[PDB]
Amino acid sequence: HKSEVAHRFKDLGEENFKALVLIAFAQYLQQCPFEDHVKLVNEVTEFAKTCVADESAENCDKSLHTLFGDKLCTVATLRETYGEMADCCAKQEPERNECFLQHKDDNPNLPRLVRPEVDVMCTAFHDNEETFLKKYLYEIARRHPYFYAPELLFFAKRYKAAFTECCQAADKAACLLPKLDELRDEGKASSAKQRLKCASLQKFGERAFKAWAVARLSQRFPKAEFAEVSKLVTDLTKVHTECCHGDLLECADDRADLAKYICENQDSISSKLKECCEKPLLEKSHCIAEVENDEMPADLPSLAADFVESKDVCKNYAEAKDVFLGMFLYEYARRHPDYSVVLLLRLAKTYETTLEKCCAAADPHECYAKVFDEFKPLVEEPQNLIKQNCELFEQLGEYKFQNALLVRYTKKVPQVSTPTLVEVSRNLGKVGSKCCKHPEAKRMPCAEDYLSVVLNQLCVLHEKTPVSDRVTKCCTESLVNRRPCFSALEVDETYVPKEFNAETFTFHADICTLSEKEEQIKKQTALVELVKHKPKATKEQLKAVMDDFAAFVEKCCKADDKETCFAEEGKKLVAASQAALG
Numbered sequence: 368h369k370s371e372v373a374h375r376f377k378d379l380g381e382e383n384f385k386a387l388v389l390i391a392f393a394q395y396l397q398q399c400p401f402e403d404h405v406k407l408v409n410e411v412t413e414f415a416k417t418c419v420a421d422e423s424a425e426n427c428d429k430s431l432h433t434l435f436g437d438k439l440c441t442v443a444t445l446r447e448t449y450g451e452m453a454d455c456c457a458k459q460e461p462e463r464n465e466c467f468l469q470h471k472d473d474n475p476n477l478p479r480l481v482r483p484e485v486d487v488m489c490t491a492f493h494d495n496e497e498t499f500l501k502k503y504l505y506e507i508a509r510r511h512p513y514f515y516a517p518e519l520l521f522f523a524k525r526y527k528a529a530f531t532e533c534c535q536a537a538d539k540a541a542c543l544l545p546k547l548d549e550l551r552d553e554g555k556a557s558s559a560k561q562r563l564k565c566a567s568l569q570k571f572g573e574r575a576f577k578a579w580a581v582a583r584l585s586q587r588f589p590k591a592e593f594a595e596v597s598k599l600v601t602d603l604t605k606v607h608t609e610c611c612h613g614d615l616l617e618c619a620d621d622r623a624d625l626a627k628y629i630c631e632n633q634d635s636i637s638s639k640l641k642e643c644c645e646k647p648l649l650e651k652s653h654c655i656a657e658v659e660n661d662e663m664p665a666d667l668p669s670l671a672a673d674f675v676e677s678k679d680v681c682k683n684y685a686e687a688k689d690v691f692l693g694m695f696l697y698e699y700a701r702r703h704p705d706y707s708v709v710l711l712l713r714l715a716k717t718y719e720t721t722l723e724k725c726c727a728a729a730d731p732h733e734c735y736a737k738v739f740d741e742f743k744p745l746v747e748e749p750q751n752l753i754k755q756n757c758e759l760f761e762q763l764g765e766y767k768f769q770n771a772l773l774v775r776y777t778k779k780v781p782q783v784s785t786p787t788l789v790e791v792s793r794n795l796g797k798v799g800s801k802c803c804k805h806p807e808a809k810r811m812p813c814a815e816d817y818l819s820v821v822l823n824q825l826c827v828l829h830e831k832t833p834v835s836d837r838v839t840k841c842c843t844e845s846l847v848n849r850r851p852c853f854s855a856l857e858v859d860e861t862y863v864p865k866e867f868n869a870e871t872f873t874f875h876a877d878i879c880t881l882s883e884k885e886e887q888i889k890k891q892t893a894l895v896e897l898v899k900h901k902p903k904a905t906k907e908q909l910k911a912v913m914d915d916f917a918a919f920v921e922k923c924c925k926a927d928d929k930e931t932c933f934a935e936e937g938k939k940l941v942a943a944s945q946a947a948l949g
């Protein structure tokens with residue numbers, strides 16, 4: 368109303384307000400120390416309480432961007448510490464805010480945040496819960512200037528919970544550690560997905576984004592009408608554009624509106640928004656965005672009616688190509704919550720191509736009549752890979768399943784670095800253990816979501832150090848063809864094996880004391896290097912060495928004079944193996 372800070376203060380609450388202001392400042396002034404930001408927060412909070420009291424008090428009328436900018440320009444060491452950015456303070460709003468956005472460092476040169484010992488961690492938490500959580504909130508926020516603030520706040524509260532439950536536990540570590548690792552990945556995944564959607568919106572444009580949304584929104588709100596889905600898709604697009612531009616406030620307002628709009632028309636969108644809509648202003652958005660798919664209508668016509676038979680296909684299609692295709696997408700997506708969004712896009716793409724070729728032919732109907740048949744092979748491809756890979760994972764464990772993927776890809780792309788291969792394969796394996804446990808109907812969507820992030824990470828590392836044209840093709844290809852492209856890679860015939868290296872296969876007793884995580888990465892690293900040396904080795908030849916090795920270790924780690932065993936038997940292993948693998 369009259370006062371913006373007052374309004375936000377009232378909605379959000381004191382605690383949330385103070386946390387968000389902190390995150391916001393940490394995201395711009397990434398270089399200032401924790402104690403400086405805390406001061407800022409206090410002053411902004413105090414000022415806020417002043418306005419809550421008297422809406423007409425000094426400055427309370429000024430907009431949030433203006434207020435935020437002024438306080439930002441208050442920092443005396445602004446130029447000394449941030450140089451160029453200080454020139455932003457000379458500009459008027461909105462150039463000022465705009466200027467600040469352009470100077471936000473997407474990834475500064477800060478030190479990796481290390482995880483302390485669980486005990487020091489639980490004691491710090493206990494002795495000063497607030498400064499312990501806020502300082503870490505600060506460290507995370509400054510390292511991820513683009514992470515949507517409210518969401519970072521959502522994570523914080525889960526972290527708080529993990530410490531309460533675990534620092535009380537008998538075995539604190541057994542409780543805490545795994546919850547922490549889970550929190551980290553979930554954080555890594557959210558981060559990666561946010562930057563991924565933004566990248567895509569930049570490269571492939573609005574249209575492509577819109578398409579992806581119709582599909583996703585349709586699977587989620589199958590009982591909504593195409594007109595509502597269009598509405599939502601338009602607003603969602605605006606939201607992402609702005610949220611991607613990086614302006615927290617604008618992004619927040621857009622999201623608030625959309626969430627409240629959805630809740631008001633809740634009855635005509637989805638029957639699973641009841642809970643989400645009764646939640647606090649700060650959680651509405653987050654909830655809705657993650658809502659389970661609603662139940663789809665039972666009395667739903669067959670597609671071929673309006674899209675294959677009907678002689679108005681080309682008529683309706685030429686009258687508004689994108690709308691018609693959007694309708695096709697809507698119709699197909701809502702009957703298939705079990706398809707990955709990108710699979711749906713491939714079908715829509717296929718349908719479009721057909722109509723382009725066909726509607727330009729004498730007898731349209733005859734030309735495009737056998738299209739739903741062209742879909743079959745498209746749908747089955749992803750399904751087959753799922754059942755096939757999920758079975759294999761059920762046999763061997765995650766670990767053993769990770770090794771198979773290790774051999775499989777080292778062969779396809781031997782140029783890639785051994786460490787990169789180990790990491791990608793490990794994360795790929797995890798997708799197997801996180802998705803294969805769901806009933807079929809949810810597998811593909813799961814794989815898509817986890818595969819998309821892992822594939823982007825893969826492409827990035829490669830952007831930096833290009834090592835293969837094939838990998839770069841897949842990486843730059845259509846986002847809808849990214850995964851298929853990687854799936855179509857075959858063994859590298861050209862590759863010339865790395866010259867043998869003794870050190871690379873020498874193992875010491877230190878291997879017996881390392882943690883599982885460590886031992887595995889140690890073994891998996893030799894494996895990639897093994898394959899990189901003998902790429903023509905068969906499943907049989909390999910399993911042989913591995914079995915020998917397997918024993919080797921266990922044997923030399925349960926016998927006196929370790930380092931002797933590994934050195935004496937080690938020579939034997941390598942000697943025999945070099946021979947078996949000719």
Ligand SMILES: CN(C)c1cccc2c(S(=O)(=O)N[C@@H](CCCNC(=N)N)C(=O)O)cccc12
Nearest residue numbers: 478479480507511519522550551553554555558
């Ligand atoms: C919940 N969310 C916001 C996160 C919590 C903790 C760590 C996160 C990280 S992380 O990078 O610190 N943690 C990962 C990635 C290593 C990258 N390190 C860099 N210095 N770049 C890790 O420790 O294996 C990234 C993204 C989100 C995170």
Ligand SMILES: CN(C)c1cccc2c(S(=O)(=O)N[C@@H](CCCNC(=N)N)C(=O)O)cccc12
Nearest residue numbers: 557561583584622625626651652653655656657
């Ligand atoms: C709450 N309003 C404003 C929404 C915001 C963002 C995404 C929404 C979606 S969605 O389908 O795009 N939801 C996305 C994930 C949301 C982003 N989540 C993050 N943690 N970053 C998806 O399922 O692929 C559906 C409905 C409402 C949404």
Ligand SMILES: CCCCCCCCCCCCCC(=O)O
Nearest residue numbers: 575577578689692693712715716
């Ligand atoms: C009005 C609704 C807009 C939806 C537009 C339908 C376009 C679907 C065709 C599929 C295109 C695949 C996406 C791409 O890679 O370009």
Ligand SMILES: CCCCCCCCCCCCCC(=O)O
Nearest residue numbers: 872890893894913916917944945
């Ligand atoms: C030509 C040198 C061959 C010797 C190298 C042996 C390295 C193989 C690594 C074994 C990894 C199998 C994983 C496991 O033991 O569970």
